[PDB]
Amino acid sequence: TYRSIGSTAYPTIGVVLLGGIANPVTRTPLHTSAGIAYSDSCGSIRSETRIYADEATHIYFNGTESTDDNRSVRRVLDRYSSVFEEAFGTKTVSYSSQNFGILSGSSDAGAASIGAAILGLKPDLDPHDVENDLRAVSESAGRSLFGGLTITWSDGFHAYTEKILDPEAFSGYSIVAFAFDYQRNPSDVIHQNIVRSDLYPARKKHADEHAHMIKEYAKTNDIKGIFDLAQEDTEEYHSILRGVGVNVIRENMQKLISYLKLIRKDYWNAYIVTGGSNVYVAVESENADRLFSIENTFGSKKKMLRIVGGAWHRRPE
Ligand SMILES: C[C@@](O)(CCO)CC(=O)[O-]
Numbered sequence: 001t002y003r004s005i006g007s008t009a010y011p012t013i014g015v016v017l018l019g020g021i022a023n024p025v026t027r028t029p030l031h032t033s034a035g036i037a038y039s040d041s042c043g044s045i046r047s048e049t050r051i052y053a054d055e056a057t058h059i060y061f062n063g064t065e066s067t068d069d070n071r072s073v074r075r076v077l078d079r080y081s082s083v084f085e086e087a088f089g090t091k092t093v094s095y096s097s098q099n100f101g102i103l104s105g106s107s108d109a110g111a112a113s114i115g116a117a118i119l120g121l122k123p124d125l126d127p128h129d130v131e132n133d134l135r136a137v138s139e140s141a142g143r144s145l146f147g148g149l150t151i152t153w154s155d156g157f158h159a160y161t162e163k164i165l166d167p168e169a170f171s172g173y174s175i176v177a178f179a180f181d182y183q184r185n186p187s188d189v190i191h192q193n194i195v196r197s198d199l200y201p202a203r204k205k206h207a208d209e210h211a212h213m214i215k216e217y218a219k220t221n222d223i224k225g226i227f228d229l230a231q232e233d234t235e236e237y238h239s240i241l242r243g244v245g246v247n248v249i250r251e252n253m254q255k256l257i258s259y260l261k262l263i264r265k266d267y268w269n270a271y272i273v274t275g276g277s278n279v280y281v282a283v284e285s286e287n288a289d290r291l292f293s294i295e296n297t298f299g300s301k302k303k304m305l306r307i308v309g310g311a312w313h314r315r316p317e
Pocket residue numbers: 013014015016017018019033139140187190274275276
């Protein structure tokens with residue numbers, strides 16, 4: 001038997017933006033969404049996981065113990081107890097997370113990294129099945145599990161994540177992230193309030209339509225079309241949220257966006273805003289350093305990002 005296994009996954013950015021969860025426990029997406037996994041050029045933005053045999057079950061986030069009192073992570077660990085018993089000689093395992101270049105705690109990358117560790121121990125499991133269990137940890141786990149550009153189809157009862165383009169399809173593109181210091185609306189507030197909107201039923205249908213449009217663009221590697229659409233999706237999504245009192249795009253964020261509209265006439269860009277106080281700007285690689293070097297970031301900090309692949313495991317120890 002072994003004693004432990006490590007794994008790694010990368011954080012994600014929504015491309016067709018998710019709002020609404022079917023149930024607080026299983027956390028199935030109410031409608032179809034799409035996303036990309038990202039890191040920096042070195043691959044240093046990441047979540048690293050260690051699952052190991054133990055006398056009692058402990059959950060740690062960057063060294064801080066969690067009472068995991070919802071049994072969010074512990075639910076997943078219990079479901080795959082047979083995997084751990086075979087691999088480690090015991091059903092009792094602990095989980096230790098270290099996040100780098102993202103905030104300490106649970107995330108899409110954290111969830112996917114759990115999946116990669118389990119698959120690492122039992123490689124003939126169906127990752128689409130494992131994904132269903134991972135959503136309890138984070139509803140967009142599939143983006144990070146499979147990597148690249150994905151679509152997660154969903155009718156609110158059954159959800160399925162499909163790989164649409166490899167990270168290699170974006171090698172000519174970069175994303176400059178502008179991080180603003182405004183306190184963010186929790187994702188749970190986003191999910192809870194968006195469904196109150198009278199436009200919500202049409203949004204769910206519009207979401208599914210946009211994902212089909214993305215699958216079509218993929219046929220000819222139309223990366224600009226995909227990101228152009230992501231910006232249109234972003235604008236619809238945040239117009240719906242504002243009408244339910246959730247305002248993600250704050251004053252200095254809107255000022256940056258206005259400038260983006262100006263330089264768009266000079267060279268191509270498209271932007272995305274998800275749930276946090278960040279503005280993500282897609283750009284052609286030849287213009288990435290130029291964008292990154294602009295002077296008036298309106299008090300935002302800058303990171304150079306790129307599209308990367310799915311979660312992966314290390315050999316068990
Ligand atoms: C707010 C948001 O990040 C929620 C994902 O659960 C939107 C998205 O990325 O699809």
